[PDB]
């Protein structure tokens, strides 16, 4: 054909068509081990305890939280936007990499989708839990009623957020689900038990793979990828405008709509990378997730990290350039004040972590990159925390200046969402086809350590 000799193989082990399907189907076709049950139990307990904390604070009062009369938001919306940021990784991997014809994405796409459907859901709890009277939440929708057709306004970003999140999730759900049709077909055709036979004959639709069916299938995925990238940007931007549209010094800005997005990409891939690292060893799919996939994840993280760095110095320049004392003081408060440790630990992580990737000896290391990928998520949690808290406890009228400290029920709810995340993801890995077969089988001949060697001789 015409492939360049420069490129390295994406498939290792001289694997054929049966080799690939057997490898991927194997974890679905067998039983879970003791270690799986131990981990599962732990995640479940954390989740159930978290539910108890949620019920308690809903039924007894928000005053059980560490919120103040000054600081109305902290840890509730902090964790909301943190989970939202995480849930943009999969929609980049399956849509953006698609649009740029990035072949290596084929071994990631499926698990990347799991990362958004199990994290957007976590975020969806906070918009309800923090509410003062959540049983009246249905009033948010513009539904004809007995109050003289009393409506809602359409000027608040909190309402815009309702539309952004509910449609973001809805669209992504049908997108990744459609991609499962040819993979469930390969499981219903195993039918080792009549129970499983029934299950996969129902999970799959009548997907008898045919010329016409595949033709349409490809076109649908192209359209949805085209629509998905705009959603990735617009949804996180609507979230961003909860602070950008304010009158509060330190929040009012124009940099947030692209800034928070860059951060979302950065933190999302850092999360994904840690799960792929443990996945390729537990599931034994290291022949599909190679060091080239890991290296490329590291490179992207490096790139977006530098974008964030530029935005940090942009804000500081403008603050100095501006003659507004209130904006300058807000930045002085972050540099030196009672929350200095949140600010400086945040900056330490975001500034230096992505810069280690310039060194090949560090970038090409599953050990080093595993550690760094974890660190990034810590720094990004503080990124969200610092912006919200440091800008509220200090503002107009010195008499209103205060502090802030969270309680065990603020912490507990967050722990609960983490536990739930892992319950869902862990169960996913034992029932779903973790690697798309329809995708891999279109690249097995184009790339791999067999065919390339053939081309070279």
């Amino acid at each position: 054909h015409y492939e360049a000799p420069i490129r390295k193989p994406l498939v290792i082990g001289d694997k054929s068509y049966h080799d690939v399907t057997v490898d991927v189907a194997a974890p679905v076709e067998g039983p879970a081990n003791k270690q799986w049950w131990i981990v599962f139990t732990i995640a479940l307990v954390a989740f159930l305890w978290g539910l108890g904390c949620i019920i308690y604070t809903v039924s007894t009062g928000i005053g059980t939280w560490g919120l103040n009369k000054t600081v109305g938001w902290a840890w509730d919306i902090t964790n909301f936007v943190w989970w939202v940021g995480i849930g943009h990784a999969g929609t980049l991997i399956s849509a953006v990499l698609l649009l740029f014809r990035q072949r290596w994405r084929m071994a990631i796409n499926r698990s990347a989708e799991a990362m958004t459907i199990f994290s957007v859901v976590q975020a969806g709890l906070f918009p309800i839990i923090h509410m003062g009277r959540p049983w009246l939440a249905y009033w948010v929708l513009p539904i004809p009623n007995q109050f003289g057709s009393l409506w809602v306004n359409f000027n608040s970003p909190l309402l815009w957020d309702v539309f952004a999140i509910s449609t973001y999730l809805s669209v992504s759900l049908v997108f990744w689900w459609t991609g499962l049709l040819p993979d469930f077909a390969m499981l219903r055709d195993r039918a080792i038990t009549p129970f499983n036979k029934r299950v996969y004959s129902i999970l799959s639709f009548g997907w008898s793979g045919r010329a016409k069916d595949w033709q349409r299938f490809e076109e649908v995925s192209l359209v949805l990828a085209g629509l998905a990238t705009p959603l990735v940007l617009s949804v996180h931007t609507i979230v961003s405008m909860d602070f950008a549209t304010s009158v509060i010094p330190g929040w009012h800005t124009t940099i947030f709509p692209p800034y928070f997005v860059a951060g979302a990409v950065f933190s999302g891939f850092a999360m994904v990378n840690t799960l792929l690292i443990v996945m390729r060893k537990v599931s034994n799919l290291e022949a599909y997730i190679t060091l080239q996939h890991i290296e490329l994840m590291n490179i992207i993280i490096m790139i977006t990290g530098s974008i964030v760095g530029v935005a940090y110095i942009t804000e500081l320049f403008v603050a100095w350039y501006s003659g507004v004392e209130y904006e300058q003081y807000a930045f002085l408060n972050r540099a030196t004040g009672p929350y200095w440790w949140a600010y400086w630990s945040m900056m330490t992580c975001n500034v230096f972590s992505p810069q280690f990737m310039w060194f090949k000896k560090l970038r090409t290391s599953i050990m080093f990159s595993f550690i760094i990928s974890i660190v990034v998520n810590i720094g990004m949690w503080f990124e969200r925390f610092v912006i919200i808290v440091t800008s509220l406890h200090r503002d107009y009228l010195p008499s209103s200046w205060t502090m802030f400290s969270p309680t065990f029920v603020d912490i507990g709810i967050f722990i609960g969402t983490i536990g739930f995340f892992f319950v869902l993801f862990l169960l996913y890995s034992r029932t779903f086809p973790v690697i798309a077969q329809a995708e891999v089988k279109t690249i097995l001949k184009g790339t791999g350590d067999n065919y390339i060697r053939e081309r070279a001789n």
Binding site: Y2, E3, A4, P5, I6, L233, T237, M241, A244, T245, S246, V247, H252, T253, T254, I255, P257, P258, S306, V310, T314, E315, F317, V318, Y321, S322, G323, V324
Partner: protein, 402 residues
């Protein structure tokens, strides 16, 4: 090689004469008039400034893309690199002219910038402005010149060695120049991002020392990067129609068409978010920026939205149309005009305000630099063969289809 048309020479000469003459013409024509007369005297000056910065950044919009395509190891771009190299020959000449203009401001031959005027910093003067004086640690003139100067070297050096090493790679039995350029381009892109942010502050936001905004430079970047892409496409269409390109087909055109489409939408995104975040919570300080634009430059302000969004929105969405030469040429022209207007809109209200118009001194500067640009680019194409030699990705690009 590339045989010069033997007609474009005289064509570009005509543009460089009629435009030049029009420029010359433009400079031959209580406290109320102290305002008005400065607005009138600035008209033929900002008419040149906007033309130079437009074409200067136009060239930079190609080099940014060039560096990206090599770093990203594109498998369809190699066949078009010679054209891109030919286009980015303007920069080492256009940047000279632009720099000279900056010097002329420094030597007080105009009133283009406010903070470069006399008596602004000192408190012993009727021209004293405390707000501007407080920003003098950044606006200090000799710092502004040096800071501007080194940005030009940081772009011109890259251009020079990129070409030099490429030609060396064409005449070698191993690699070493490919990898050399790979490393250089990566370094360039890092530098570029930093110099881009500062550049916008110094050359565009410096027209209004009483106004600031975050997300300005990224907006500016998009406003020229998009136009850079369309200029690439238009040159390759021309050369192809004249029989000078081989291994070029509608899939290469299509790929560029959809590329420029997506990034033109991105420009619109940035435009709106900047506007709305001021409009939504109109804290009066920093709001007059839009007040004086909406009330005066009504059609320019909103027309720039339509031409850079609405028009291509209903054109470059049909994949069959993306392969048609006249569809692509048409859209390219509209986009270029739209971004010219974008720069016009950003600069004009700060120099002439309500005395603005699009007559002789504006048209003349456009045509002058148009002719200059054409002359340099097509001359450059005769100094090197199209379709580079041994290159690690050229064999697949010669068979590229989509």
């Amino acid at each position: 090689m590339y045989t010069f048309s033997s007609k474009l020479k005289t064509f570009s000469i005509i543009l460089m004469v009629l435009g030049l003459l029009g420029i010359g013409y433009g400079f031959l024509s209580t406290e109320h008039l102290n305002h008005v007369l400065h607005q009138l005297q600035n008209k033929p000056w900002s008419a040149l400034y906007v033309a130079c910065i437009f074409f200067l950044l136009l060239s930079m919009g190609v080099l940014a893309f060039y560096a990206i395509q090599q770093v990203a190891q594109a498998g369809w771009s190699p066949v078009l690199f010679r054209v891109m190299q030919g286009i980015t020959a303007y920069l080492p000449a256009g940047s000279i002219i632009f720099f000279i203009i900056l010097v002329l401001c420094g030597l007080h031959f105009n009133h283009i910038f406010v903070w470069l005027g006399e008596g602004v910093t000192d408190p012993k003067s009727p021209n004293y402005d405390a707000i501007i004086a407080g920003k003098s640690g950044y606006l200090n003139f000799p710092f502004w010149i040096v800071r501007a100067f080194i940005f030009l070297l940081g772009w011109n050096i890259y251009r020079h060695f990129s070409r030099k090493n490429c030609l060396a790679q064409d005449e070698a039995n191993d690699d070493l120049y490919y990898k050399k350029n790979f490393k250089i381009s990566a370094g360039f892109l890092v530098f570029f991002i930093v110099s881009e942010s500062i550049m916008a502050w110094d050359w565009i936001m410096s027209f209004d020392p009483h106004w600031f905004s975050t997300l300005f430079a990224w907006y500016v970047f998009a406003s020229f990067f998009v136009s850079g892409i369309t200029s690439i496409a238009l040159i390759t269409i021309y050369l192809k129609s004249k029989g000078y390109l081989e291994y070029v087909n509608t899939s290469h055109i299509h790929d560029l068409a959809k590329f420029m489409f997506g990034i033109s939408v991105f420009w619109t995104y940035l435009w709106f978010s900047q506007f709305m975040l001021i409009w939504y919570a109109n804290i009066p300080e920093e709001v007059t920026y839009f007040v004086t634009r909406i009330q005066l430059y009504n059609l320019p302000f909103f027309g720039a939205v339509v031409m850079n969004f609405v028009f291509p929105l209903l054109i470059l969405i049909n994949t069959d149309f993306k392969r048609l030469n006249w569809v692509v040429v048409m859209a390219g022209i509209v986009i270029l005009l739209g971004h010219y207007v974008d720069f016009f809109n950003m600069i004009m209200p700060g120099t002439v305000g309500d005395k603005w118009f699009i007559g002789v001194p504006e048209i003349a500067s456009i045509l002058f630099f148009l002719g200059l640009f054409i002359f340099v680019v097509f001359t450059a194409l005769t100094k090197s063969p199209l379709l580079a030699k041994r290159n690690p990705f050229i064999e697949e690009s010669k068979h590229f289809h989509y």
